[PDB]
Amino acid sequence: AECVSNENVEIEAPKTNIWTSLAKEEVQEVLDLLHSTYNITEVTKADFFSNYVLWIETLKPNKTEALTYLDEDGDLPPRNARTVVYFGEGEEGYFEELKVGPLPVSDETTIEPLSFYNTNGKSKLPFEVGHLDRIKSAAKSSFLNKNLNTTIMRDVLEGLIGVPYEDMGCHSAAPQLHDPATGATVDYGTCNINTENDAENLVPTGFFFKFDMTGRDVSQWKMLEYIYNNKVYTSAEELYEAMQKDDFVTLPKIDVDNLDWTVIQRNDSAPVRHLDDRKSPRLVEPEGRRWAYDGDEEYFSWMDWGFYTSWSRDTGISFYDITFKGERIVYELSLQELIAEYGSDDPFNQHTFYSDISYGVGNRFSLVPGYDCPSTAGYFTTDTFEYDEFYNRTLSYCVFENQEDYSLLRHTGASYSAITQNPTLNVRFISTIGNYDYNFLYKFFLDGTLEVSVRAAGYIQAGYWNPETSAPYGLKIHDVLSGSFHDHVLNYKVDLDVGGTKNRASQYVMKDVDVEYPWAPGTVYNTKQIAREVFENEDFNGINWPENGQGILLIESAEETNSFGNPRAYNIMPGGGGVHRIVKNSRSGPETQNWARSNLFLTKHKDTELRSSTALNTNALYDPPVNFNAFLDDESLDGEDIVAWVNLGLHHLPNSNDLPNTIFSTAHASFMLTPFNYFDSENSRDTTQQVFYTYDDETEESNWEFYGNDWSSCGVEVAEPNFEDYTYGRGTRINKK
Amino acid sequence: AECVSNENVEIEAPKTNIWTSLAKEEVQEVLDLLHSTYNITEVTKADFFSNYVLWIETLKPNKTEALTYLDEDGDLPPRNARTVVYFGEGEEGYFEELKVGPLPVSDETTIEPLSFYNTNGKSKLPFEVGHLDRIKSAAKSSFLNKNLNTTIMRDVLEGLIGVPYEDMGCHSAAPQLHDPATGATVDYGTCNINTENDAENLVPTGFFFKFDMTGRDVSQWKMLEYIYNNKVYTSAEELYEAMQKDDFVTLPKIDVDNLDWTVIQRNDSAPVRHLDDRKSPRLVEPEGRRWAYDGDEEYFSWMDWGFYTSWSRDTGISFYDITFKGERIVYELSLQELIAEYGSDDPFNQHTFYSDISYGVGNRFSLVPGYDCPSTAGYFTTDTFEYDEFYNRTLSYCVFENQEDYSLLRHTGASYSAITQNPTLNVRFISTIGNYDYNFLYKFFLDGTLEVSVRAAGYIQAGYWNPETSAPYGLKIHDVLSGSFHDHVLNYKVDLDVGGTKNRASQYVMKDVDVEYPWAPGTVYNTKQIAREVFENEDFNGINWPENGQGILLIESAEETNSFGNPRAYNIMPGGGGVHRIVKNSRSGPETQNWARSNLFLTKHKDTELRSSTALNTNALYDPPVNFNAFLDDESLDGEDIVAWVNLGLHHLPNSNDLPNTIFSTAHASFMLTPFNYFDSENSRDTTQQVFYTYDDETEESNWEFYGNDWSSCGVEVAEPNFEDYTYGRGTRINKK
Numbered sequence A, B: 001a002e003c004v005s006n007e008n009v010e011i012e013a014p015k016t017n018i019w020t021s022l023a024k025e026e027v028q029e030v031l032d033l034l035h036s037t038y039n040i041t042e043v044t045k046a047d048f049f050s051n052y053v054l055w056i057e058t059l060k061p062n063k064t065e066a067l068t069y070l071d072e073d074g075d076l077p078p079r080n081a082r083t084v085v086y087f088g089e090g091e092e093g094y095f096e097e098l099k100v101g102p103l104p105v106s107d108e109t110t111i112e113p114l115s116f117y118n119t120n121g122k123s124k125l126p127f128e129v130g131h132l133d134r135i136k137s138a139a140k141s142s143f144l145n146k147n148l149n150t151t152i153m154r155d156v157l158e159g160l161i162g163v164p165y166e167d168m169g170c171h172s173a174a175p176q177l178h179d180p181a182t183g184a185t186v187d188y189g190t191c192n193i194n195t196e197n198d199a200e201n202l203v204p205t206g207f208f209f210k211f212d213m214t215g216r217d218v219s220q221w222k223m224l225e226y227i228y229n230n231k232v233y234t235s236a237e238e239l240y241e242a243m244q245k246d247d248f249v250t251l252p253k254i255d256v257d258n259l260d261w262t263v264i265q266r267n268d269s270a271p272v273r274h275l276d277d278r279k280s281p282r283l284v285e286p287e288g289r290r291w292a293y294d295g296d297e298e299y300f301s302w303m304d305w306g307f308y309t310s311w312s313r314d315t316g317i318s319f320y321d322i323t324f325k326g327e328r329i330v331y332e333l334s335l336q337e338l339i340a341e342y343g344s345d346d347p348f349n350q351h352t353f354y355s356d357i358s359y360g361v362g363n364r365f366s367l368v369p370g371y372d373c374p375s376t377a378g379y380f381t382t383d384t385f386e387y388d389e390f391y392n393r394t395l396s397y398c399v400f401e402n403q404e405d406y407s408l409l410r411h412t413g414a415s416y417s418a419i420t421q422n423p424t425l426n427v428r429f430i431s432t433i434g435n436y437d438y439n440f441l442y443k444f445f446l447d448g449t450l451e452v453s454v455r456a457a458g459y460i461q462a463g464y465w466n467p468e469t470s471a472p473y474g475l476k477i478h479d480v481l482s483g484s485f486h487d488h489v490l491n492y493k494v495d496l497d498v499g500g501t502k503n504r505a506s507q508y509v510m511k512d513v514d515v516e517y518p519w520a521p522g523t524v525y526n527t528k529q530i531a532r533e534v535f536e537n538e539d540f541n542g543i544n545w546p547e548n549g550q551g552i553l554l555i556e557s558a559e560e561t562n563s564f565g566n567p568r569a570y571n572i573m574p575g576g577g578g579v580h581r582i583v584k585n586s587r588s589g590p591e592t593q594n595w596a597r598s599n600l601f602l603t604k605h606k607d608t609e610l611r612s613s614t615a616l617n618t619n620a621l622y623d624p625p626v627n628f629n630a631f632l633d634d635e636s637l638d639g640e641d642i643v644a645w646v647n648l649g650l651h652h653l654p655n656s657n658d659l660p661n662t663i664f665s666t667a668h669a670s671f672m673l674t675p676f677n678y679f680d681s682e683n684s685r686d687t688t689q690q691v692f693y694t695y696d697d698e699t700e701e702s703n704w705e706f707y708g709n710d711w712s713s714c715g716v717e718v719a720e721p722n723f724e725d726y727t728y729g730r731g732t733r734i735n736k737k
């Protein structure tokens, strides 16, 4: 017979999602007010001397006002926007962050400089250290074409590289290099062979350059150097003349006629593996979906968990008010930043230290149904605003229930077997940022554990292989290609509030010790002990996971205990990828990413310490809007609202197993938040997704208790995914405007 | 319409499984020959002065003869049995290992002392350090009853504990403590309250004792001490008299009337979570099974992988001749040992250092269909022989194809999206050894990566909570219960043969370094580099995973390279649980478990270094059959057949989340073996389980390429698991005898 079908369930959220992105109408009201207050130019007509709007987004509520609303019948917090506007109308240009609110627009609405979350106390970001925005990108591109497409440079480039200028693409290293001592801003760059399949990163040419881009007048910008085979030339003419001499060394050129090694998808001439003409397995829901949601509030419930989601252009998804069995465990869980920091012999890769939130993690592409998420997933639409357009992104994140490949627990003994299944709620989004594809997963378990993970895939940023200098910095993975060495590091703000806001952070340290026991006087034993140590103060050094795993890190309630006197706690448990930066002192990130140097940091919660990086950090090398180290000022954590800033990372040394692409299976990092004396007992025991088998010794009869789950054979339709809902591109745009 | 069904596929193995367990007929021939050669007593009639047979199993072939057979058209290696026989007919008793072969029995068959794989050079294990076999267990049990069930001790026990002798169970700590300097063998013990649900480990009484069990004449065995509240009494009478004094302290007694906190299975009075009245998700195979097997040879194929399995009483499953795309990567992969080493204030837990292979990992229970493995799993029968009976164990291990919850790789760019699914082959067995349930998984990926993992669940071995002394060694997790601190450590023999047997082991060390580049003279940069270092010699210290993950460990072919000159290699990549023992010098395991002190060891392959522990190790504290450290003798590894002995572990400090049972989700350890320059490229690209989506900019049309996989909706039957095949117990026995 047919399996019993049930419909998807919707619920009403306990409260309003006060963290949600601005509605289209709210964005429009703000943009309209900006246009009536200032002389705003459309981005498509703008230059460095115009004013124009970049960003308009929710300025999220402060925590005390949010908690009063959620927990104590408080007023809705004010609805405010953060906007970022470039002002070029003055003697000097700058970006300024402005607060617009409250909303909706009324006679109470104002526009004010906004800086409370910037540790440097400034609303204004100087032009020299400005955002690499559409206007600056276009200016740089035009400048490079002006220099590289001369009669002489066309000849130089074709001579060295083997293809004409039209067949390559030249571009600039990030971040830019502004020197506050001299005022100069310089930048390096390289060229890569053009491909039809987005594989430019696998065909770097080894031709480099350096330019001065100081000031808002591009007529004063100048090429400083051309660099090739580790030699520096101070003009096109010098390099051209050097190339005419008999002693000139041209390094091996890329074979542009044979690029099949860069292609990801199956060669349909390839043999099929045995049985690969059968479809692989599918997850199904025989009795329908087991999580519920409020569509308007983006509030989700599953097996006694509840939470709200929010979306930003900078970072993608965040979670607020994460509750389990009716108690908040985490106020805010939010990815903060992702860096990719390269080491190299060459002046492009050695100057690459990406801030992915500067580019945007939340302004990318839809998920591919059936492949990126299981076919049983539900999909959600989010939005952003950039440069005069509201972007609606369908299939932006997905929610699905997995059946994990192992049971949650079991035991066999005393003539019974008791086994509990392990269904999990899963929230995923994937951000493809140029060459990289980052896969973010949040996995919730029946006992109250949550696992946060990331996997990376996509094309690597390789480098040109110069046998004389490249070997310390990468493996030779193709004829003229190095797998350039880099660190990925990701910061998560984990605002645990265990048994209320007032908490303590502690560690149980494990050690071997020699002891004598009262029951064997005089006999020394080498044994092992625990010792609880309280993290009394913010530690500038952060916390690194202990050698040989010899410690357990807790966030404890300051006052609440379980029935046996233990502080209610959650354990922050590292999984794979518990690594931080190798490099200590980067010229490409002196002060911009100071959270990335230890595994984790504990701080006192502050509304002014909203975020560990900003989209405005990356080029502001010495005076970024947020210098994370400002948070670390030795404050007591001993009965305080604590935030853990937890890092995941990978030291990536690409090899053959990264061509044509890196794989997600071995590029993985995760951590868990797991109850530790948070209850009196383990709290999955109430699930019905378990079996109790008993055997009677006398009667020789077995009994199976399935707790209302009928495992009898039944028929289902294995449904086609919603492929028709997937359209390529970075969201549907509506110009405002 | 209905999904297209296909039948399970069977294949013929390339060769015979020369590692397989003895057939019933082979065991019978050996037992018959032992009975005709020696005076053998049935185990049920045996004592310490009898001779009797314990074990009869395959003595696996040596490696060179195996490889000649597999690869070079060699003869089948000789078919031999290892037997272990207790001989008590002499002046002193001992166990002896004997080789019986070749088989089948003929005039060529002999019986010889067997010791080549014992580093101590002995076939004979003295009685004092003997196996804790059925005969010795029975003698100890009888001795304890003789002492503890006297009129005086019945009164002492009821007075201190609160229930009569009939309502408790008293038992001995493992290992025993034999002192070679004096010849004495002693042992500690405790008592636990009897339960109906195998939860005795949650109700330890805090009553301890110590006895001398030296020699084969039990009439000379003597109780030495009773220990209670950290006080030592040298007789029952002394303790009884102390208990009559007004100043005697009786510690708080267990509440035996309220033990519901020990119960695993659902309380059907408990509320149901929202939507838990719907069945959780199921994995299905819409087009049938995609792995094949040879049922007689226990040879398995999946997506270009091949391997044979073997089963032993000591360790469970092993893998031989693991091939990927027609090349052997691993000759032998075999779990070797699992230890559980406790630290405590009390003389039971402090003297607990289990060797789980002494008890047997491969002589346990069947898997529960649908719960222990997915419903799409296939199940396999294995066998053992112990104490006159051949045991056939159905549902002993399972094989299934998972769909992992994340794709293997993807990329979006240049108007396409390319995503590859991540189906994996999975081989599981579960060994429930008393209180512990160990879940072993071997997971194979499309690119040639394999992941080895373990998860633990079941009841903890807790201890009595004495407020005066217990706190350094555990948390108070119930009214009179400590979560005793312990290490789990597991050893795997990983005989990688990368591009042949002759290999090198290397590490790429990662470090930050200050450098000056030729293209910026005089400017110092702090960057990062790699350096390849060869492990030239066996290192007595072993290898511990590097701080901050700053290294990659390889097994390289000595001679074979890929097309870019890199040695073909596999990377041994740690996942979670990359920990080793905390304790350094245990009185309960001085020389018996010397592999457990570092994360991994590399040695030169030897047939005499078959195994890192034995079932005969645990009580032989100073002179075990195998002392692992004997393998570490500074031999060159620089172009040699290398074996990696890889450890997984957990430092377990039980908390509330371990009552009533530990959970598998957070008690996890794993490592991966992943290709590293082993090919020229990443080798999943030929799978059909991928999609290539393209978008045409001009025509505004999308195209989907599914490589022959039809995702159209189709009907399937979701089948009932084979629950009828699950019978409780540790295998069906046939007495031989």
Ligand SMILES: *[C@@H]1O[C@H](CO)[C@@H](O[C@@H]2O[C@H](CO)[C@@H](O[C@@H]3O[C@H](CO)[C@@H](O)[C@H](O)[C@@H]3O)[C@H](O)[C@H]2NC(C)=O)[C@H](O)[C@H]1NC(C)=O
Residues within 6 Å of the ligand: A061, A062, A078, A115, A116, A117, A607, A608
């Ligand atoms: C959320 O909490 C933040 C941080 O406590 C609040 O920040 C405060 O915002 C006000 C403006 O609304 C700032 O006042 C301004 O200060 C400048 C500089 O002295 C002064 O010139 C202006 O006239 C104005 O008074 C205030 O400095 C700032 N506090 C901090 C510590 O930076 C914010 O108001 C809170 N948000 C909401 C919605 O309540």
Ligand SMILES: *[C@@H]1O[C@H](CO)[C@@H](O[C@@H]2O[C@H](CO)[C@@H](O[C@@H]3O[C@H](CO)[C@@H](O)[C@H](O)[C@@H]3O)[C@H](O)[C@H]2NC(C)=O)[C@H](O)[C@H]1NC(C)=O
Residues within 6 Å of the ligand: B061, B062, B078, B115, B116, B117, B607, B608
């Ligand atoms: C597999 O390899 C092992 C290790 O190389 C071989 O072990 C050898 O086994 C023979 C017995 O079959 C041992 O010979 C005996 O030595 C004793 C002691 O000196 C002697 O008294 C006996 O008369 C006999 O010669 C030999 O010592 C042992 N080698 C080592 C290094 O321990 C084993 O034979 C191989 N198995 C197969 C099936 O070929």
Ligand SMILES: *[C@@H]1O[C@H](CO)[C@@H](O)[C@H](O)[C@H]1NC(C)=O
Residues within 6 Å of the ligand: A039, A041, A049, A050, A051
């Ligand atoms: C607005 O700025 C533009 C130049 O960006 C200028 O031409 C125009 O006069 C300004 N508008 C007003 C009303 O002054």
Ligand SMILES: *[C@@H]1O[C@H](CO)[C@@H](O)[C@H](O)[C@H]1NC(C)=O
Residues within 6 Å of the ligand: A145, A149, A151
């Ligand atoms: C580069 O110069 C060539 C001729 O010298 C011209 O045809 C082409 O349009 C130029 N490219 C760009 C992008 O300006």
Ligand SMILES: *[C@@H]1O[C@H](CO)[C@@H](O)[C@H](O)[C@H]1NC(C)=O
Residues within 6 Å of the ligand: A260, A261, A263, A267, A269, A270
């Ligand atoms: C496809 O396979 C053919 C034949 O093996 C090979 O020559 C070619 O390089 C492959 N093409 C691509 C695009 O991968």
Ligand SMILES: *[C@@H]1O[C@H](CO)[C@@H](O)[C@H](O)[C@H]1NC(C)=O
Residues within 6 Å of the ligand: A024, A381, A392, A393, A394
């Ligand atoms: C965003 O997309 C959703 C789903 O298609 C739709 O309901 C909503 O109206 C869209 N918003 C706008 C203003 O386009």
Ligand SMILES: *[C@@H]1O[C@H](CO)[C@@H](O)[C@H](O)[C@H]1NC(C)=O
Residues within 6 Å of the ligand: B039, B041, B049, B050, B051
């Ligand atoms: C075998 O041993 C038993 C004692 O275990 C003894 O009674 C018997 O005489 C022995 N058999 C022979 C044939 O000597």
Ligand SMILES: *[C@@H]1O[C@H](CO)[C@@H](O)[C@H](O)[C@H]1NC(C)=O
Residues within 6 Å of the ligand: B145, B149, B151
């Ligand atoms: C213990 O002694 C009691 C009486 O003193 C007796 O009834 C019981 O059978 C004894 N138990 C055992 C296991 O010998």
Ligand SMILES: *[C@@H]1O[C@H](CO)[C@@H](O)[C@H](O)[C@H]1NC(C)=O
Residues within 6 Å of the ligand: B260, B261, B263, B267, B269, B270
């Ligand atoms: C079952 O639930 C009842 C009511 O909550 C409780 O009193 C009892 O202790 C539970 N029993 C078991 C066996 O867990």
Ligand SMILES: *[C@@H]1O[C@H](CO)[C@@H](O)[C@H](O)[C@H]1NC(C)=O
Residues within 6 Å of the ligand: B024, B381, B392, B393, B394
């Ligand atoms: C072991 O069990 C399998 C499967 O039930 C069966 O085919 C085989 O005959 C059994 N072996 C013996 C000798 O009982």
Ligand SMILES: [Ca+2]
Residues within 6 Å of the ligand: A331, A495, A496, A497, A498, A501, A503, A605, A641, A642, A643
């Ligand atoms: Ca907090």
Ligand SMILES: [Ca+2]
Residues within 6 Å of the ligand: A538, A603, A604, A630, A631, A632, A633, A634, A635
């Ligand atoms: Ca602080």
Ligand SMILES: [Ca+2]
Residues within 6 Å of the ligand: B331, B495, B496, B497, B498, B501, B503, B605, B641, B642, B643
């Ligand atoms: Ca080897």
Ligand SMILES: [Ca+2]
Residues within 6 Å of the ligand: B538, B603, B604, B630, B631, B632, B633, B634, B635
């Ligand atoms: Ca050696």
Ligand SMILES: [Cl-]
Residues within 6 Å of the ligand: A121, A122, A123, A124
């Ligand atoms: Cl300012």
Ligand SMILES: [Cl-]
Residues within 6 Å of the ligand: A253, A254, A255, A256, A479, A480
């Ligand atoms: Cl090339």
